[PDB]
Amino acid sequence: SGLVPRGSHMSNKPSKPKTNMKHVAGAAAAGAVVGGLGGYMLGSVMSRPLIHFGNDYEDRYYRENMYRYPNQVYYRPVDQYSNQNNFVHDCVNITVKQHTVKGENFTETDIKIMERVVEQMCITQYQRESQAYYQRGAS
Q: Where is the lipid attached (GPI-anchor amidated alanine)?
């Protein structure tokens, strides 16, 4: 037998009284500036290569359109539940959205390489994400 009294758990302590009404953000307003992704990490600074073609044309083309398109990319933090694909999967899609955006368009031929630089940029990022992800200890 065993039907002892059990089933009592509670934890709540909202100690954050916010009675302030001063949320001024300086001065900046004109027309309208889009910006709604959700919360994806944005590359701050980098040095090493992101994509390696190997062919002359494929090489010159990349460095040629280098200024045409940005270098930053939206990616999420890795995890133990899944592999890099967890973030790399949407990493490419999201990038394609801002890449193929009406703001700028490229030829059918450019889309070929553009997809490579972006794709490789997603996986190549996993190396860094893991470097910081592995580190345990927030001092």
A: 138
